[PDB]
Short mmCIF file of C-alpha atoms and ligand atoms in Angstrom, two decimals:
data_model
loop_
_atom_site.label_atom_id
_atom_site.label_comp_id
_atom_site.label_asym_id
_atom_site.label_seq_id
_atom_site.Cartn_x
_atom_site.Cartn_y
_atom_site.Cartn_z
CA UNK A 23 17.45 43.59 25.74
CA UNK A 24 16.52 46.81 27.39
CA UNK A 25 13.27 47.64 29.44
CA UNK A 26 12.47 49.86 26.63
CA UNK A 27 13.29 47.77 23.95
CA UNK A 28 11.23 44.88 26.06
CA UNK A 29 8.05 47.19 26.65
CA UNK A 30 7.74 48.05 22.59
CA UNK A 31 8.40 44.31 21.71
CA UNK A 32 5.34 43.22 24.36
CA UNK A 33 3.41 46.00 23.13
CA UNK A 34 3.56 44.63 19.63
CA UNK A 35 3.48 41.06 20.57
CA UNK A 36 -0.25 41.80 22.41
CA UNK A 37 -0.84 43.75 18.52
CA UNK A 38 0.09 40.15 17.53
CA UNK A 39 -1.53 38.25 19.60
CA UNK A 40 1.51 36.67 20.29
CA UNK A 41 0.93 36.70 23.78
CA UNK A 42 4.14 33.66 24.78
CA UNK A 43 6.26 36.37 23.58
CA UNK A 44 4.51 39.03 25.44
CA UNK A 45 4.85 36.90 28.22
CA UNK A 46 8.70 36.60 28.11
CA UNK A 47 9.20 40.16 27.25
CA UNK A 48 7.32 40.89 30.66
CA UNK A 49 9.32 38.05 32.46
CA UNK A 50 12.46 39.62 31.41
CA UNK A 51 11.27 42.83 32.38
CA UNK A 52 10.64 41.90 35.59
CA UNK A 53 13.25 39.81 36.07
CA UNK A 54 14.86 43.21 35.84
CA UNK A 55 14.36 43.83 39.18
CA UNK A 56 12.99 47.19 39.30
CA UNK A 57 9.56 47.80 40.26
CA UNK A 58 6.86 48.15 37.13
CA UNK A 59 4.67 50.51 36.10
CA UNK A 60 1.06 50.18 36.39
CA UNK A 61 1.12 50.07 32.90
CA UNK A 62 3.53 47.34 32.98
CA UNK A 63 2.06 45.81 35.31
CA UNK A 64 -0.89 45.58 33.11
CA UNK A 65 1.09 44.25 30.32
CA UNK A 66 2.41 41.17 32.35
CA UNK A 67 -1.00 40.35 33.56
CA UNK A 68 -1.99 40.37 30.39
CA UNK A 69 -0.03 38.26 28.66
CA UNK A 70 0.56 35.11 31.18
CA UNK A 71 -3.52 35.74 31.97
CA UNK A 72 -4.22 34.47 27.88
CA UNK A 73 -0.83 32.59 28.56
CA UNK A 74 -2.68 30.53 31.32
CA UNK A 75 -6.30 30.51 30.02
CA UNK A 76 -5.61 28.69 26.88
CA UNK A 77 -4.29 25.74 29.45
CA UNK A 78 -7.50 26.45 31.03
CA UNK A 79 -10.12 26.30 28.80
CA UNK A 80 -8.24 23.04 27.00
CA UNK A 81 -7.42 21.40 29.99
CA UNK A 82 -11.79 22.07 30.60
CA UNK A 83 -12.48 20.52 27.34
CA UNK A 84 -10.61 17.25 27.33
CA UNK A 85 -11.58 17.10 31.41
CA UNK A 86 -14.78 17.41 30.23
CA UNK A 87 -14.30 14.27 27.44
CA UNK A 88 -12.84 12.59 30.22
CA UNK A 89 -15.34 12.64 32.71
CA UNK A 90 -18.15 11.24 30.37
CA UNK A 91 -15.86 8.24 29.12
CA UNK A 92 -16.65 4.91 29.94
CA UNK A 93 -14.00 3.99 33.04
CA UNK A 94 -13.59 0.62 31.00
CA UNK A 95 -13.00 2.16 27.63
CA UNK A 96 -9.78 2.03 26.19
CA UNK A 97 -10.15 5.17 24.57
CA UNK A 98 -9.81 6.77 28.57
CA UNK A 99 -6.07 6.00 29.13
CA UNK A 100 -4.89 8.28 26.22
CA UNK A 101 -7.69 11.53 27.51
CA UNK A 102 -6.41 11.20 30.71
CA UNK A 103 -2.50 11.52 29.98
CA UNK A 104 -3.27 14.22 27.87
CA UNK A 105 -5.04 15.94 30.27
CA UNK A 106 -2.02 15.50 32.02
CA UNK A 107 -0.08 16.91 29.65
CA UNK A 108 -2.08 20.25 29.63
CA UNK A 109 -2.08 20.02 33.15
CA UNK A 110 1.90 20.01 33.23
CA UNK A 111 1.71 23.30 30.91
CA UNK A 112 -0.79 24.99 33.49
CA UNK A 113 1.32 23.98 36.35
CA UNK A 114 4.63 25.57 34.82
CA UNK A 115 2.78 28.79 33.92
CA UNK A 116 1.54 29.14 37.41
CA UNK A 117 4.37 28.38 38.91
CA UNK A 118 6.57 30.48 36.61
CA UNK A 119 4.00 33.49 37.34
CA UNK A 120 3.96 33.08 41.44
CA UNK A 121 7.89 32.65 41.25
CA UNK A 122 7.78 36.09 39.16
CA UNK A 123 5.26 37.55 42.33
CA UNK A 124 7.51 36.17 45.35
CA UNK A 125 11.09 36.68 44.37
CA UNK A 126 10.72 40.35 42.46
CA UNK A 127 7.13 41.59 42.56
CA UNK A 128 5.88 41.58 46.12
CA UNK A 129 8.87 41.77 47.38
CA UNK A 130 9.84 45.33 46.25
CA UNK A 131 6.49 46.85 45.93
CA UNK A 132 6.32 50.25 47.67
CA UNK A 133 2.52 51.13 47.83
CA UNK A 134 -0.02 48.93 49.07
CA UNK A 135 -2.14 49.76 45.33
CA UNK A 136 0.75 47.27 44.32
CA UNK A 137 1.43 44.61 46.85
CA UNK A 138 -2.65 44.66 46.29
CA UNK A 139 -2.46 43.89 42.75
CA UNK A 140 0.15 41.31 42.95
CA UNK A 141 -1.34 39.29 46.18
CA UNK A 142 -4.66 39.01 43.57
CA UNK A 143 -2.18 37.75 41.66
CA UNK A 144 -1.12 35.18 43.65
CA UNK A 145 -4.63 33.98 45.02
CA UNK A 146 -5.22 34.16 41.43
CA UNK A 147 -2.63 31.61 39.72
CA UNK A 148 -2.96 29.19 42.79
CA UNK A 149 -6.99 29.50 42.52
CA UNK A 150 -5.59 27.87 38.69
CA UNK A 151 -3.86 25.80 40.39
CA UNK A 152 -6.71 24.51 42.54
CA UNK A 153 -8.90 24.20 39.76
CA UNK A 154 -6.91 21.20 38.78
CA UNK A 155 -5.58 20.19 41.93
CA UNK A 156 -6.78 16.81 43.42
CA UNK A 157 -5.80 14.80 47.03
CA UNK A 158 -3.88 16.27 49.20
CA UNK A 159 -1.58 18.91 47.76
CA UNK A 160 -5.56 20.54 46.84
CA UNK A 161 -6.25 21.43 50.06
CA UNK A 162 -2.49 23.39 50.72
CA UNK A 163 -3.32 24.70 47.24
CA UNK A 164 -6.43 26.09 48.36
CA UNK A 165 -4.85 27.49 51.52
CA UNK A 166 -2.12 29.32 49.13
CA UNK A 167 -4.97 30.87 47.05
CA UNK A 168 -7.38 31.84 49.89
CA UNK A 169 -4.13 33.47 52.09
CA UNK A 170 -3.39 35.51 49.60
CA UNK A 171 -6.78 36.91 48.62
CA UNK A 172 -7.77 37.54 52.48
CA UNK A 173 -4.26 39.59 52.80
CA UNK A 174 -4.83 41.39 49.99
CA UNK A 175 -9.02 41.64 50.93
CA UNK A 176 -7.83 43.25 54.14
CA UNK A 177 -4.83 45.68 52.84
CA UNK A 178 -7.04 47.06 50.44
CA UNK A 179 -9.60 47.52 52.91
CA UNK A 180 -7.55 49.61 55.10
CA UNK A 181 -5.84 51.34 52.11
CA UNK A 182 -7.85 51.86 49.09
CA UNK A 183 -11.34 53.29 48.21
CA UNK A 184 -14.78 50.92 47.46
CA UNK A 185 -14.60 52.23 44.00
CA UNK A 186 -10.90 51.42 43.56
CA UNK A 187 -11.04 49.17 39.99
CA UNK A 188 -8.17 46.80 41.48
CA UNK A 189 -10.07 46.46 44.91
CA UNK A 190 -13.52 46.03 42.63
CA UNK A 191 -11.47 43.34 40.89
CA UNK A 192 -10.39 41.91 44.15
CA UNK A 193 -13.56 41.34 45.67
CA UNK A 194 -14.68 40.01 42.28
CA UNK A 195 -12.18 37.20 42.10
CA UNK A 196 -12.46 36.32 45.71
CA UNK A 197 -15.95 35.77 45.57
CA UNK A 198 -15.34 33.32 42.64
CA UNK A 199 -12.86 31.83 45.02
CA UNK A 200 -14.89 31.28 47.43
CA UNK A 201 -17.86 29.78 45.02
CA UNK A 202 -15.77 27.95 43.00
CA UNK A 203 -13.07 26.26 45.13
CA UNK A 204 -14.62 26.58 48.80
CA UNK A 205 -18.59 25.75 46.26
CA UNK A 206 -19.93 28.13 49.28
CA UNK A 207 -22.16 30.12 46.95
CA UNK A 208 -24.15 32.04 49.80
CA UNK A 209 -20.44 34.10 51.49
CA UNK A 210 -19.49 34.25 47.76
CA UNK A 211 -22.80 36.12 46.87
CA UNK A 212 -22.17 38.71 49.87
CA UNK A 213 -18.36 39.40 48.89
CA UNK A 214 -19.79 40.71 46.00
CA UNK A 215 -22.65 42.19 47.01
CA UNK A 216 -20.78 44.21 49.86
CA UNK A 217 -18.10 45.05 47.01
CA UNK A 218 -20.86 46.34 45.04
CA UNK A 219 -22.71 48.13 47.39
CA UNK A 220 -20.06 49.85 48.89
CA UNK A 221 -19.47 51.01 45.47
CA UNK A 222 -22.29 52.44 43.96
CA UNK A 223 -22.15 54.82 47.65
CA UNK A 224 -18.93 56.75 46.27
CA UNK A 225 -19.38 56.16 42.70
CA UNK A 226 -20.64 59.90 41.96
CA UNK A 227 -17.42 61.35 43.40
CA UNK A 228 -15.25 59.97 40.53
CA UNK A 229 -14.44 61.66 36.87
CA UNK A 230 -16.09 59.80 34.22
CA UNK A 231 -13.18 57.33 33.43
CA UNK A 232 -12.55 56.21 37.00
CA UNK A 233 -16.60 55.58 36.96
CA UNK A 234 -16.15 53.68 33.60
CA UNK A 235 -13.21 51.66 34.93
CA UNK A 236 -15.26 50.50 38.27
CA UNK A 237 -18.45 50.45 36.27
CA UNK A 238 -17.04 48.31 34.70
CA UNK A 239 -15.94 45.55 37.47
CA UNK A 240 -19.37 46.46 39.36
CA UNK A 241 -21.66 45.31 36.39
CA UNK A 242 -19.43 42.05 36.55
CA UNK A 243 -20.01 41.58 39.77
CA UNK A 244 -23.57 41.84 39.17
CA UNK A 245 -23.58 39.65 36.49
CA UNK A 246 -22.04 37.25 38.88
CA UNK A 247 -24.82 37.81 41.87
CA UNK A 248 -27.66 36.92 39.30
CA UNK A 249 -25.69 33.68 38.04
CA UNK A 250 -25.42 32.64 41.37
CA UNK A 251 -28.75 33.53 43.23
CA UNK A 252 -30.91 31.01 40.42
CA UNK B 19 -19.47 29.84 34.46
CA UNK B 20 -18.60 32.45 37.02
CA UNK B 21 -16.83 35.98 35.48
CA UNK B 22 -13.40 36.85 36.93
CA UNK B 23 -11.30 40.07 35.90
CA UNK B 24 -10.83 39.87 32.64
CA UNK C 18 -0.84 3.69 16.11
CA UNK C 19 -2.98 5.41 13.41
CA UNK C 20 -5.90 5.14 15.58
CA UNK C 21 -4.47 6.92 18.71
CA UNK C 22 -3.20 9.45 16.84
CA UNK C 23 -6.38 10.27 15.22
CA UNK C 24 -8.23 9.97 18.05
CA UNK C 25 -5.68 12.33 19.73
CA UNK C 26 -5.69 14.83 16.95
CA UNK C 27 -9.47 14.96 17.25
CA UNK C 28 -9.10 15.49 21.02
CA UNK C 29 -6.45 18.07 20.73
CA UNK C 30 -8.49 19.18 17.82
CA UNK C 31 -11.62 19.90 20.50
CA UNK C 32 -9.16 21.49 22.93
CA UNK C 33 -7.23 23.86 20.12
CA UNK C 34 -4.31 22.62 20.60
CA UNK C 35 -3.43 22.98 16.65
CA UNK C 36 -0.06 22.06 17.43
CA UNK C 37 -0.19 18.84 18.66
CA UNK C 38 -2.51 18.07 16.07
CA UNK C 39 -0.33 18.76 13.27
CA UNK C 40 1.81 16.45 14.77
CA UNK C 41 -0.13 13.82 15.15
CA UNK C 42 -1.58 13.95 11.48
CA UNK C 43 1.76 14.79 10.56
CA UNK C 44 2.90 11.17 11.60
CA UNK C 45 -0.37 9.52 10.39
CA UNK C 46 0.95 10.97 7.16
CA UNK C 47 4.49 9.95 7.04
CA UNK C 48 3.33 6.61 7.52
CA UNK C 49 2.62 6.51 3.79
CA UNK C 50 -1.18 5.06 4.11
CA UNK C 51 -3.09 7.36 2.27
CA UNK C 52 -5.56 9.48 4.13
CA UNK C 53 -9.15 9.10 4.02
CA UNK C 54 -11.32 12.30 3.56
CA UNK C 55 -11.71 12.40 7.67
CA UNK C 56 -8.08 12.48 7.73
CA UNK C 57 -7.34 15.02 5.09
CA UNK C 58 -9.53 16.96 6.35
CA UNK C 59 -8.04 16.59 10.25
CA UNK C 60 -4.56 17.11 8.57
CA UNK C 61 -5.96 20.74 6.49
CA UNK C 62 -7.65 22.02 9.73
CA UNK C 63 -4.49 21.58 11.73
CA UNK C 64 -2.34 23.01 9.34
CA UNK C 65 -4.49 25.96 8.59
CA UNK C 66 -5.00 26.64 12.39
CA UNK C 67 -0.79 26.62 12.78
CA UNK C 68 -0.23 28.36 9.91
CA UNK C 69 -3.56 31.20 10.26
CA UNK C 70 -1.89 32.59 13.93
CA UNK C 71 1.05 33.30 12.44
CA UNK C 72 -0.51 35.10 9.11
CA UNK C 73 -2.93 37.16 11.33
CA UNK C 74 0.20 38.56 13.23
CA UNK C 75 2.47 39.23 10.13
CA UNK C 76 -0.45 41.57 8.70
CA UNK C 77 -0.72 42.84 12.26
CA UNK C 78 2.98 43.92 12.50
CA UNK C 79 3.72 44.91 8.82
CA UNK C 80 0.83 47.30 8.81
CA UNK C 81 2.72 48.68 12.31
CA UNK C 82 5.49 48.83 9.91
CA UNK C 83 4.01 50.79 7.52
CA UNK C 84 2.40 53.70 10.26
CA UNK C 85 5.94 53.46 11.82
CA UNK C 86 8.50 56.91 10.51
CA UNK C 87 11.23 55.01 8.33
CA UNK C 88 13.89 57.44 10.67
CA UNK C 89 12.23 56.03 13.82
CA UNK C 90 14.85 54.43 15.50
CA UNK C 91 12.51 51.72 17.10
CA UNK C 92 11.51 50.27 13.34
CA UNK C 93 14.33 47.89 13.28
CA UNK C 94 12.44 45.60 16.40
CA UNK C 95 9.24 45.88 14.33
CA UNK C 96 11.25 44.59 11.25
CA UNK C 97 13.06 41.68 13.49
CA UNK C 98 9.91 40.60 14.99
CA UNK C 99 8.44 40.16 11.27
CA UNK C 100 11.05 38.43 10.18
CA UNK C 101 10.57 36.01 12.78
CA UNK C 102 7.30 35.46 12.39
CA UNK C 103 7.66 34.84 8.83
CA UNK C 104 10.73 32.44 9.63
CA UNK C 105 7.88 30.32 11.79
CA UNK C 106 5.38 31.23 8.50
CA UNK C 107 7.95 29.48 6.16
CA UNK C 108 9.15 26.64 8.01
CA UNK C 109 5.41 25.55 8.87
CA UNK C 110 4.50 26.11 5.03
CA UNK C 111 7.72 24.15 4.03
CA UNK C 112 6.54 20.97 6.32
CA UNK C 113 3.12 21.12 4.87
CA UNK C 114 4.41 21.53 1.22
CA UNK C 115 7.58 18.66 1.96
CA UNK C 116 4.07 16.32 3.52
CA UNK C 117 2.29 16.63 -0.36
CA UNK C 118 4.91 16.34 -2.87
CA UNK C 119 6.54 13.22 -0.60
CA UNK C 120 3.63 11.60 1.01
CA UNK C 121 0.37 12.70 -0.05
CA UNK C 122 0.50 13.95 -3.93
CA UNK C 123 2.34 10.72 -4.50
CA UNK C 124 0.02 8.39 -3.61
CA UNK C 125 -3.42 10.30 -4.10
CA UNK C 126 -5.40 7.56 -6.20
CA UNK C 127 -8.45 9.49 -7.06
CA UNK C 128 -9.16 13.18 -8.70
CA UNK C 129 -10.57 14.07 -5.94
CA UNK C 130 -7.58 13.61 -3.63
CA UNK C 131 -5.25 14.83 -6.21
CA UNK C 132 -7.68 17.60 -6.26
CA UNK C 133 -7.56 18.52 -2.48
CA UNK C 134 -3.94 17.92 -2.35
CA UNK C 135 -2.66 19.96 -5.31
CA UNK C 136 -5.09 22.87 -4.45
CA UNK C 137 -3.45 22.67 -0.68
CA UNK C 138 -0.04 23.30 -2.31
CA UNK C 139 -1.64 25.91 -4.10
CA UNK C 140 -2.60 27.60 -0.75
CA UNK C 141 0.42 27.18 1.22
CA UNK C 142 2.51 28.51 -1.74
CA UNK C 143 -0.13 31.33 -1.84
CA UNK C 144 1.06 31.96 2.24
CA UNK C 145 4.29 32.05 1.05
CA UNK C 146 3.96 34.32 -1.60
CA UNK C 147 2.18 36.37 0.93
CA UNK C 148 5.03 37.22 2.68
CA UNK C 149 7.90 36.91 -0.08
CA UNK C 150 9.03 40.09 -1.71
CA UNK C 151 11.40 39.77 -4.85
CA UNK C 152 12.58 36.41 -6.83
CA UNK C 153 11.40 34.56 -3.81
CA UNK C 154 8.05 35.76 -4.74
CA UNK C 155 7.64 35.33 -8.29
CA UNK C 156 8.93 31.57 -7.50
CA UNK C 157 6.12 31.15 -4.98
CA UNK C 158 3.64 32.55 -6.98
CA UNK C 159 5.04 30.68 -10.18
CA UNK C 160 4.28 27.50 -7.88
CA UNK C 161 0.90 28.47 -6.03
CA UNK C 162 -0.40 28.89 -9.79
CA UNK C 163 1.05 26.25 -11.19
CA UNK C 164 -0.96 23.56 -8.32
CA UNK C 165 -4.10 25.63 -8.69
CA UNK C 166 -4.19 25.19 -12.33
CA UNK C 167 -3.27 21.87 -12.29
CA UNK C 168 -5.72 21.32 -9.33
CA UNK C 169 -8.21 23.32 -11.56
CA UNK C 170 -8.10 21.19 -14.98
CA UNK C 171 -8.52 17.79 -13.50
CA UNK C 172 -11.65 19.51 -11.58
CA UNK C 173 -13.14 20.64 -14.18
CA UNK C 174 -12.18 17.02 -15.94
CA UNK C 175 -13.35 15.18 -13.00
CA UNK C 176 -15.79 16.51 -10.42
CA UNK C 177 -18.78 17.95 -10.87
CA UNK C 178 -19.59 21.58 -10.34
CA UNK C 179 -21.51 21.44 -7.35
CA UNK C 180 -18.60 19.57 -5.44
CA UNK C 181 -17.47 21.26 -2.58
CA UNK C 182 -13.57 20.43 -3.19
CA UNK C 183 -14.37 21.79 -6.40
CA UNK C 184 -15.72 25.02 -5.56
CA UNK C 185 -13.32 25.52 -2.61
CA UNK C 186 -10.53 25.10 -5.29
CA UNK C 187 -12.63 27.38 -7.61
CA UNK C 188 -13.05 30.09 -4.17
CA UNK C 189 -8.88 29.84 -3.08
CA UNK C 190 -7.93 30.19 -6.96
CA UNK C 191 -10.14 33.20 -7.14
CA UNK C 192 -8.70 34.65 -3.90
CA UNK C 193 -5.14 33.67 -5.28
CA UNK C 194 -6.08 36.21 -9.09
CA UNK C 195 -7.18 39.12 -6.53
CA UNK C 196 -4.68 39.02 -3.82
CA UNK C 197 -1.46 37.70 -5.63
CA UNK C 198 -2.17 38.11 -9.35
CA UNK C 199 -3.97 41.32 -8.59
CA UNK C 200 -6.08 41.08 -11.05
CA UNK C 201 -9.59 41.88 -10.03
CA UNK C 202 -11.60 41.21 -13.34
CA UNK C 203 -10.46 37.46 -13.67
CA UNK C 204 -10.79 36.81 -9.64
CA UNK C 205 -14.39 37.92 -10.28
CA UNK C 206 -15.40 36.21 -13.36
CA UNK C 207 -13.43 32.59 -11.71
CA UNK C 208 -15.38 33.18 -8.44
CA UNK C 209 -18.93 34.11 -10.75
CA UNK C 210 -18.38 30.87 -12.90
CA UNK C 211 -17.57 28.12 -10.64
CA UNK C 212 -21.06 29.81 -8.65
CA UNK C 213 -23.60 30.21 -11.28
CA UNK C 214 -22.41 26.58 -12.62
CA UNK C 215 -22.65 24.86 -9.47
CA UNK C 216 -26.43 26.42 -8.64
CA UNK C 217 -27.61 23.70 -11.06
CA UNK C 218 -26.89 20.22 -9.89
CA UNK C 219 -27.50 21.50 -5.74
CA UNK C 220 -30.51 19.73 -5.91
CA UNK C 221 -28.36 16.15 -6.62
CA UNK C 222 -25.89 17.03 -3.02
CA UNK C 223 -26.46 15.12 0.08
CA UNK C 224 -26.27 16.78 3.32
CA UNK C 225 -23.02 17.63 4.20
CA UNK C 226 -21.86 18.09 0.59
CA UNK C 227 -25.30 20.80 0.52
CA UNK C 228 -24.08 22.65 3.48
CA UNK C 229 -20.43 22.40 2.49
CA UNK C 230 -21.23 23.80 -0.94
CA UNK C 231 -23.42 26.27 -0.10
CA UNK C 232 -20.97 27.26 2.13
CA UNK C 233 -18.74 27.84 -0.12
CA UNK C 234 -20.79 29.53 -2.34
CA UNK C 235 -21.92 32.30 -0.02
CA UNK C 236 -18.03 32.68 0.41
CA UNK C 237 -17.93 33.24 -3.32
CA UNK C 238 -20.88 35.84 -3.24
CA UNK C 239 -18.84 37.78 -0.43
CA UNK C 240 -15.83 38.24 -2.20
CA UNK C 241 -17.76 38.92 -5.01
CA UNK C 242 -19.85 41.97 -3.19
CA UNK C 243 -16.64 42.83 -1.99
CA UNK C 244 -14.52 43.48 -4.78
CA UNK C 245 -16.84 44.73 -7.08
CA UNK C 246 -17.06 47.47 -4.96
CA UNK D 8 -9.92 40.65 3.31
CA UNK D 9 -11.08 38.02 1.02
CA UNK D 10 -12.61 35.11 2.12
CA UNK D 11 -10.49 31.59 1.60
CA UNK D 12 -12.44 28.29 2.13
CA UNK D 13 -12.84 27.39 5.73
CA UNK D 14 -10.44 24.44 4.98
MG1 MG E 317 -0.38 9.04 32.45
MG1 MG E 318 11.63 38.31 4.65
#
């Protein structure tokens, strides 16, 4: 199928909430190998992000069972391999994603707004990956994750604006890196609140749906800076 | 639970 | 293995995995025991969580059908894409509806379980009817109507009023005269009678039959609001 | 829509 043909049929997959199908149309897409769209872009995001955070959110529930279950129960053997099983799901989507981001999508992007947004991608899907991770291979897992947010922490701080919404949405998911994986709540409360601050400074200067878009990511950052400082 | 980009 | 796999549906149950689930009450089922009300009731919420996705996206894509210009040459995706979804709509209703007449209609040994059952083929023949269009259609409807009816008479028969399988039946038989039938009047006055006759005996329910009935019954004064008007 | 038991 054709890029176009593969843009409508993602388009009405998200209608759907189909969003596997999404996700393949945008895997084909970029398996293309041209370089997407922003809006395309978007669109693959999109779909492995609800792709990946059903795995998540299961894979917290039955963790969740697990880790309250008598370690002499009976009952614990059959949690834990299906935990595993989820697990194995989340593991494939991550890997399928950061296999999409090496081979085709960092590797021919052609404006650091891009090779921004897709090395948050990749701190992103191995920060999933860490979230499950345990022994050794969490620790390289971790170094993946934090390697690619500091590259793409320092490219967009030589290339992009403080009100940029990607480099707002940077700073946002490093600092839940860094209080989440690293549990380092006090250098995770400053990434955000330099984010932030260096924000609001340049805020005024935008139209009114660049301020919406970074209003946006700066009153989740904020959100996050209470949580954390309680 | 801590908010990432959604 | 009945117990792992009803201990696994309820896990997967807690984690939404719907599909595995369905599976695993799917094999509790073909092992011919019959199910006890926990287990009917993990088998319908599977089911209806497998089958509800893929409902939700056919109205989502037919009404993009219906706003898209019948010259447009992009219609033809939208029209593929529905038919798939309704091929996954009709081969999840046909395992449901192959489970109660070969397993669970068979053995049903109470009115109440004959009850649940043949009102369940009444629903999944209702999603198929949903999406059939021509003889396909009148067949499904001919066979949605025929299990609610059936469903209906040994409910009435049986069970009293105020019983929640009752007034569920009473509620989906009701939605089945206003969506399929399309006959407003009757939906009402089904929906209005199984209510006003169950508000007598409430005060005879337990707990969970209270909540599960008035439940139900606040579902019946909904649609009623809503199609009167 | 109408409603259908929660089922
Ligand atoms: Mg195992
Ligand atoms: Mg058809």
């Amino acid at each position: 199928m054709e890029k176009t043909e593969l843009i409508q049929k993602a388009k009405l997959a998200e209608q759907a909430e189909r969003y596997d199908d999404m996700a393949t149309c945008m895997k084909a897409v970029t398996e293309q190998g041209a370089e997407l769209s922003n809006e395309e872009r978007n669109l693959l995001s999109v779909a492995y992000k609800n792709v990946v955070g059903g795995r998540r959110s299961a894979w917290r529930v039955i963790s969740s069972i697990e880790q309250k279950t008598d370690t002499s129960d009976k009952k614990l053997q059959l949690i834990k391999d299906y935990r595993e099983k989820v697990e194995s799901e989340l593991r494939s989507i991550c890997t399928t994603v950061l296999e999409l981001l090496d081979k085709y999508l960092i590797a021919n992007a052609t404006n650091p707004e891009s090779k921004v947004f897709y090395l948050k991608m990749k701190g992103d899907y191995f920060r999933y990956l860490a979230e499950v991770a345990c022994g050794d291979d969490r620790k390289q897992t971790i170094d993946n994750s934090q390697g690619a947010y500091q590259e793409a922490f320092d490219i967009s701080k030589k290339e992009m604006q403080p009100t940029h919404p990607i480099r707002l949405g940077l700073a946002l998911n490093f600092s839940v890196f860094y209080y989440e994986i690293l549990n380092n709540p006090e250098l995770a409360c400053t990434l955000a609140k330099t984010a932030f601050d260096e924000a609001i400074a340049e805020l005024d200067t935008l139209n009114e749906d660049s301020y919406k878009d970074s209003t946006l990511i700066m009153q989740l950052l904020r959100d996050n800076l209470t949580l954390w400082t309680s | 639970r801590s908010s990432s980009m959604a």
